[model samples]
Target chain A: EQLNGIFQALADPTRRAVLGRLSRGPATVSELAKPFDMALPSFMKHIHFLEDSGWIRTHKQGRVRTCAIEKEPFTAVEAWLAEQQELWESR
Target chain B: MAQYPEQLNGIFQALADPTRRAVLGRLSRGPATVSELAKPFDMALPSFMKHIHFLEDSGWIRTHKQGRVRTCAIEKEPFTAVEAWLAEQQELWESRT
Candidate 1:
């Protein structure tokens, strides 16, 4: 489920851009949405998708919802890549 | 811990398409022009471009244009990222025994 969610989250360009922005540091939802042209609600859906998928973690304080990138998945992704290269090399 | 399942789903989902996989296989050999890559497929250029764009968006490949030609080559980080995940799973299972 974890790996599946990570890839699924990465499928969309909007979502990928969101990740790219968040990679720099944490930011509020509106802050993340500022660079893109989409509407707030539509943009929120992508944020929700990212949050649900474990690529990011978020919390609300007052009215602002801040999001941050989660590094665990990248580690997992890199690990899987290393494993495959090893297998390919051995065979 | 296991992580980012949706991301994996997206990555594999992109790969689930035959056209995209064919592109990757071709790229494995070397970089090629967009037209060159599109030559073997029956789809229209616009439709084929969608797959190339998808691959770029997914971080599987990168493209650069030289005058009129747009060439693509596989982006290795995404591949390594996916393989790293498989390695983690195996390690977890192995450690359990």
Candidate 2:
């Protein structure tokens, strides 16, 4: 299921931290990578992982690349949780 | 699966399967014996045991044996990991407006 990809992406703390940073507002790749001590290329891999997994979207403008969180994966995760809760509570 | 240096890899991987999900769903209400949990599936006992092992190994569920039967109960820690992440993100996003 598509939930697999979303969960896999969320499985990393760095990626989750990246999501938390972007949640505050959209930021350029370098800006997003600032809080962490990792190399730019290493951090970019997390960005790519988030983007590839549909949790975030990235776009280029001139020389800067920006990232924003995507709502679909969040909705899917919430829905799955709700489904599980419903099944559990109905008993 | 690609390597992730987080415990969530195992937690999420355990959840990726329908059988395991169903098992968790069942255990969510109350603990159940291995046989009771495996009743709905068509797989053999040994094959189903693998799922049980996976769930236990992943920290999604805990199992113990008594009187020759192993019982499984759902653990809330992994769910907290997920909910906490979602909550932190949602809080950050909401404060942006």
lDDT against the true structure, each candidate:
0.75, 0.84
Clashing pairs in 2: none
Candidate 2 residue lDDT tens string, B1-97 = 3233477667777876778878887887888899899889999999999999999998999999989899888888888767766887787788876
Model 2 C-alpha lDDT per residue in residues A1-91, reported as the tens digit of each score: 5776787777677887788788898899989988999989898899998998899999998999999899999899898888777766784
lDDT of 1 by residue, B1-97 (tens): 4446555555656664768867876777677899999999999999999999988887888999989899898877767555655555445434643
Per-residue error for A65 in candidate 2, Å, reads: 1.5
Query: Which stretches in model 1 have alpha-carbon errors above 4 Å?
Result: B1-12, B15-97
Q: How would the docking of model 1 be graded? A: incorrect
Candidate 1 is scored at a TM of 0.53
